[PDB]
């Protein structure tokens, strides 16, 4: 309900690197005072959360246009089992930056060869039990 996100995806086989472009976003819900939020998008490889990339902060727009580009130096063999995460955050100067949305893209569903660029609907990020342990015994 927050809005949609237009992004670009393609792989450069000449340098063996992933080219992820953040085009823009639309119809984002407002969380700030003026009637518009201050959005910025954090993008990182889904498999390992290392070297996350963040875009510049846009002031008071529910339709931010970033038109930015990020490069993930990852071989083509490892790429297949690697996912992409694009999460939209709301900037706040005096508090925690609340997450507006998130989107995950499996690299086995992605087809490289033609330059991909699409709009995808944003969804609410996941917050389960912490322990995840089990004990087995018998009663008689």
């Amino acid at each position: 309900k927050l809005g949609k996100l237009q992004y670009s995806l393609d792989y450069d086989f000449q340098n063996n690197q992933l080219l992820v472009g953040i085009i823009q976003a639309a119809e984002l819900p407002a969380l700030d005072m003026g009637g518009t939020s201050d959005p910025y998008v954090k993008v990182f490889l889904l498999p390992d959360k290392k070297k996350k990339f963040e875009t510049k902060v846009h002031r008071k727009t529910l339709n931010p246009v970033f038109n930015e580009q990020f490069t993930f130096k990852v071989p083509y063999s490892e790429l297949g089992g690697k996912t992409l995460v694009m999460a939209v955050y709301d900037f706040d100067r005096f508090s925690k930056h609340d997450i507006i949305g998130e989107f995950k893209v499996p690299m086995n569903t992605v087809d490289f060869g033609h330059v991909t660029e699409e709009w995808r609907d944003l969804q609410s990020a996941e917050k389960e039990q912490e322990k995840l342990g089990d004990i087995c015994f018998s009663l008689r």
Partner: protein, 64 residues
């Protein structure tokens, strides 16, 4: 030489206009490509919904 220069000016203008035509041709072609990709997407989704609605119609008329 006036004959020649006049012609020279003409050729220069033609040069500039040709350059602009080049730029326009590039923008044109690029956007044509992107729109073609979009059309491919449209036909994918349209076939998907075609199958969806055929199966759904069959299942709906099944309970009649």
């Amino acid at each position: 030489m006036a004959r020649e220069n006049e012609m020279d000016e003409n050729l220069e203008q033609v040069s500039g206009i040709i350059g602009n035509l080049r730029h326009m041709a590039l923008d044109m072609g690029n956007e044509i490509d992107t729109q073609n990709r979009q059309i491919d997407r449209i036909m994918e989704k349209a076939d998907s919904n075609k199958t969806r609605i055929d199966e759904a119609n069959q299942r709906a008329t099944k309970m009649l």
